Design a binder for this molecule. Sequence first.
Ligand SMILES: [Zn+2]
Length: 140
Amino acid sequence: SGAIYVGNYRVVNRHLATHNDWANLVWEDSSRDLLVSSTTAQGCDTIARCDCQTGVYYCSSRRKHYPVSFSKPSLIFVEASEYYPARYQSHLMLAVGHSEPGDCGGILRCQHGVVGIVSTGGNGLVGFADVRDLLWLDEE
Ligand SMILES: [Zn+2]
């Protein structure tokens, strides 16, 4: 589980979005596993605006933050998980590390702020759904 709270936006994995998220929908994209809903309270997370390929992510299944190198956001084939079929996922960044389904929503951060949230796992890789291209998160 986990979310990004920026301005009046809540960023979650689409597959974990709640009824309240869908009833307050701003934007969703299945191919990215992202959903954004509107909040009544202002959020304080800073979104990274950068092309960093190093940062730190939270791994709930190890209660640990790991420093990792990660690939640039790309269209990648993801093998079947308990929450998605085998399919292509867009704007996905891979690192070498541990990821289980319950780790979805863990923050990846760099020196510029929030890069993305854990979205995929398995075969010793962790996949992160990038949010750095969503510049509208910072305004309105
Ligand atoms: Zn950065």
